[PDB]
Amino acid sequence: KKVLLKVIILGDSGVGKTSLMNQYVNKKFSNQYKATIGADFLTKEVMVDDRLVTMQIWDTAGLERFQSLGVAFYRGADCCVLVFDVTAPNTFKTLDSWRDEFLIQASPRDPENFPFVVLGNKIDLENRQVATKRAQAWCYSKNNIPYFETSAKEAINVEQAFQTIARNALK
């Protein structure tokens, strides 16, 4: 039987949230950058221990700071995707802000076990600025959030991030 999951992608502007979503669903990438304006979605069918999941993936304007969207949007959510840019340490220091802002607006009853995934995006580029150990430690401190280093450009670990939040939400 069909199961809907709504997935929110959060993070600073330019970290690659649109790129990651388009790579997951459309499987393509564009080096040209054009800022996301409000919140909007793409939908794709995935599957999890032989049960079909309709996954509604939402893109948020990073410049908008997760602020004036609907309760209908905030409380509809079942998964949160936190994205930072490994070549940009400020995008990492804002993770606590994005996760706190999600937990305030989305307000899950069981935040500890809410399906989060953290993506250090853009590892295809050299000149990393954020140490892997440091992101691992941050993700661990928030009761062991699953951590992936990803590239929407080279399609590295996008499937793993989405599968992880899908499985853990279906629990």
């Binding site: 409380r75 509809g76 307000s107």
Partner: protein
């Protein structure tokens, strides 16, 4: 064209006008309740089999399948109680005492999380159902009222309720014509808007849950944007016999009248089509965006009395429409999607 009609069977074990008719979450069972308080849980796959039959001494007004524990049926009485009924044991599990002075349990919604249900408890009728009411979140395994929702401005009878997919949101329609959307942990409504000049009769989330549908006493079927506080997305005027009042008349000067009490509109598995009521049988519309009129893409027929409530059970790409009418008959039309 989209649907191939494979057949129509009739369930005829009720002998009074049907009030509710709902398929469980598995698709394999129906619960149906008539105005004389008779409950039937029955199968149609592979044979039309009355799996259980109760006669309630007290009036019953609403009916709702459990989601987590399918085989559990919730039944709202006219004496302020909610009965949990085990359809595989054919047995009452319990009767939860909801409210003393507001006895009409007009609506029930089981949370998809399996722990709680929301119910609507309205004062007695007598525009007869613009009286006050309560909307309560009840936590079944603690056996206590977890939350009472604020019905601004005044308490009002809630006709109809529906949960979103994760159970965080509840859309409701009241006797005063207002839709109210409630967060399951804020007692204040997250959102409300005037929706019908008249009572709201049925509400439902769209498949993708970015809009809500309502059908109202003013005869209109409206889709609302719940990301922009009930901004009308689309509006349609359904035939007069889709919202009633439903009237069965005889040569004897004896007439029965029924105001929408049950499910008025039902959807295929992903919301492209909508079953509704008519005097002759179910009428299926497509829901694409012509925006001036809805195209009537299929008509099921088969009823000699007005249809007052519908349901649409989907799996297999094999849909199964239920149409229930005032002579107590329930028709079951099986469709194949193409």
């Amino acid at each position: 064209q989209p649907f191939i009609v494979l057949g129509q069977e009739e369930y005829g074990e009720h002998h009074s006008s049907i009030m509710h008719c709902r398929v469980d979450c598995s698709g394999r069972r129906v619960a149906s309740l008539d105005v004389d308080g008779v409950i039937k849980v029955w199968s149609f796959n592979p044979i039309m089999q009355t799996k259980a039959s109760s006669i309630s001494k007290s009036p019953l007004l609403s009916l709702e399948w459990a989601t987590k524990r399918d085989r559990l049926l919730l039944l709202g009485s006219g004496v302020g109680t909610v009965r949990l009924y085990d359809t595989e044991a054919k047995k009452n599990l319990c009767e939860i005492n909801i409210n003393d002075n507001m006895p009409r349990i007009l609506s029930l919604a089981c949370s998809p999380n399996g722990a709680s249900f929301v119910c609507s408890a309205a004062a007695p009728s007598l525009g007869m159902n613009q009286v006050p009411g309560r909307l309560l979140l009840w936590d079944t395994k603690t056996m206590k009222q977890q939350l009472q929702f604020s019905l601004d401005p005044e308490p009002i009878a809630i006709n109809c309720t529906a949960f979103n997919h994760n159970g965080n949101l509840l859309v409701t329609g009241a006797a005063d014509g207002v839709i109210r959307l409630f967060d399951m942990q804020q007692h204040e409504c997250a959102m409300s808007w005037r929706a019908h000049y008249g009572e709201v009769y049925s509400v439902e989330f769209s498949y993708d849950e970015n809009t809500v549908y309502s059908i109202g006493e003013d005869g209109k079927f409206i889709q609302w944007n719940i990301h922009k506080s009930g901004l009308k997305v689309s509006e349609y005027s359904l035939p007069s016999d889709a919202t009633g009042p439903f009237v069965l008349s005889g040569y004897s000067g004896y007439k029965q009248v029924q105001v929408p009490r049950g499910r008025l509109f039902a959807f295929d598995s992903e919301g492209n089509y909508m079953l509704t009521c008519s005097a002759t049988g179910g009428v299926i519309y497509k829901l694409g965006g012509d925006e001036k009129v809805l195209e009537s893409c299929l008509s099921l027929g088969g009823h000699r009395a007005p249809v007052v409530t519908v349901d649409w059970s989907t799996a297999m790409d094999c849909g199964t429409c239920l149409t229930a009418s005032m002579d107590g008959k329930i028709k079951l039309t099986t469709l194949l999607a193409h």
